[PDB]
Each structure stands twice: as structure tokens, then as C-alpha cells.
């Protein structure tokens with residue numbers, strides 16, 4: 697690895713190898729080097745245009761199926777844990793279960809007004825997963841957040857309309873009232889039940 701050409705080639709290969717290994721793709725680097733050399737020298741490829749196209753389409757299809765099965769398995773695993781968590785939590789002191797499946801516990805009751813669907817609210821909050829992983833919070837920005845009541849996840853919309861201004865609640869949000877069966881790879885996987893501590897500061901008609 698003395699030249700910049702060798703170092704670049706190696707770095708690309710290592711990036712590829714790490715990506716393949718991370719996806720469980722069993723690959724033969726020598727056979728791949730040979731096909732790469734053949735393509736670049738202008739030689740006759742050891743496979744026809746069609747054999748290769750068939751090979752790579754079978755490859756993609758298997759990958760999607762594998763990725764889909766991992767999604768569904770994770771979606772089901774999170775649903776199961778969520779239902780387990782909520783079934784245990786409904787028994788605990790102070791926990792109220794609402795018709796939509798949203799649960800909450802009043803930590804402190806305010807005396808202000810309850811926001812309506814159209815109002816805007818200012819709130820402090822922390823959102824966490826069932827394992828305690830915090831995925832968001834106003835306590836980094838050290839500044840209240842502001843939201844229209846109708847433009848947040850349904851669990852918040854249902855909770856806020858019950859909350860007097862000044863109140864602090866913990867709410868326990870079934871995935872159907874949060875982000876449902878979705879994963880953009882972010883901190884929230886599919887069918888995740890969420891827990892929020894929400895302090896409602898003010899309501900704005």
C-alpha cells in the first residue's frame with residue numbers, strides 16, 4: 697500500500713466490506729476483484745449480460761425480503777413490549793386509562809385553562825422509550841417549545857385537551873397514538889410506545 701492509488705483502492709474495499717458484513721452478505725473478494733478487473737480492462741466477462749442481471753436482481757429481492765422480515769420482527773417485538781408495559785402500568789397508583797388507550801398520571805395539577813384543538817401551547821417536556829432512552833427534551837434548548845394542539849402526535853392532542861395550564865403530567869402513549877408502524881432509522885423504531893413528561897405553561901387561542 698505504497699501509493700495513493702493503492703490506499704484509495706484499499707479504503708474503498710474496506711468500506712464495502714464493512715457494509716457487506718453489516719448486512720450479512722457473504723461475498724468472495726477474489727471473485728469480485730476478478731469481475732472488477734475484467735470490466736475495467738475491457739475483457740470478455742465470465743458471465744453474460746443476462747446471467748449477471750438475473751444474479752443481481754435475485755440479490756436485491758433477497759435483500760428486501762431480509763430487510764422486510766427484520767422490520768416486521770422488530771415491529772412485532774416493540775408492539776408486544778408496548779402492550780406489556782401498558783398492561784402493567786394501568787395498575788399503578790395515579791394512572792388513568794382513557795378510551796383511546798392513552799394513559800396518564802398527574803404529577804401536579806394546574807389551575808389554568810384547557811387548550812382546544814385550534815389553540816397553541818407552550819410546554820416543557822421529556823420524551824423517552826420504555827427502556828429509559830430519552831429521545832427528545834426541551835431541557836437541552838433550555839427553552840419552552842411551542843406547538844399547535846392539532847399538529848402534534850395524537851397522544852399529545854388527546855392529553856393536552858385535558859390538561860389545565862400550569863399542570864405537569866406523565867403520559868404513556870400507545871404506538872397508534874404516536875408514530876405507529878414506522879422507522880426512518882431515527883431514535884424511534886416501529887410500533888414504539890412512548891412516555892412523556894409534559895409541563896403545560898400557557899395556552900393561546
Ligand SMILES: [Zn+2]
Pocket residue numbers: 796854
Ligand atoms: Zn379522542
